[PDB]
Amino acid sequence: PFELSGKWITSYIGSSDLEKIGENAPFQVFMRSIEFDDKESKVYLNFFSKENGICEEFSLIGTKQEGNTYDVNYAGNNKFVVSYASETALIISNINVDEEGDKTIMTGLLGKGTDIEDQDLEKFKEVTRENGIPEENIVNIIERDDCPA
Ligand SMILES: O=C(c1ccccc1)c1ccccc1
């Protein structure tokens, strides 16, 4: 039986729009935890991001929607789904529509710390590829996460 709630740290992110994931972009997200509250149909997300190269922390609350998808407001509107779950990782697929109306598809591989299991990494590359995102649009987040624990 799986527990999806708990500490989750980003290892890699892929994006159909590179403007959304480099240095200080809104979706270069360093996850810290995700709590799924199925009783209240909500999800709680805590993570760091950088603006001005300095770490900033966010705690968001999303709403459970149809088909195990969640809606959450952050740099526009987001609809995401936990596409894959193992005992060591989560792969999340997110569609963002920003304030300008531009749509971006992104994937993220999450784990319990810094030591990546290749089996989880191969699944992340396949989900990324399936979403039309090229290999070169993958950023290594563990290498860039120097925000507090
Ligand atoms: O792109 C997101 C994401 C980034 C890394 C892992 C999981 C999800 C995201 C989705 C919804 C809200 C905030 C951030």
Curated annotation (Swiss-Prot):
Major subcellular location class: secreted
Keywords for the protein's UniProt record, in alphabetical order: Disulfide bond, Olfaction, Pyrrolidone carboxylic acid, Secreted, Sensory transduction, Transport
Gene Ontology biological-process entries: sensory perception of smell
Keyword Metal-binding attributed: no
Protein location: Secreted
Disulfide bonds: 55-147
Molecular function as annotated in GO: odorant binding; small molecule binding
Pfam families per UniProt: Lipocalin (PF00061)
One term under GO cellular component: extracellular space
Family the UniProt entry places it in: Belongs to the calycin superfamily. Lipocalin family.
Job description of the protein: This protein is found in nasal epithelium and it binds a wide variety of chemical odorants.
Subunit structure, interactors included: Monomer.
Protein name stated in the entry: Odorant-binding protein
Annotated source species: Sus scrofa
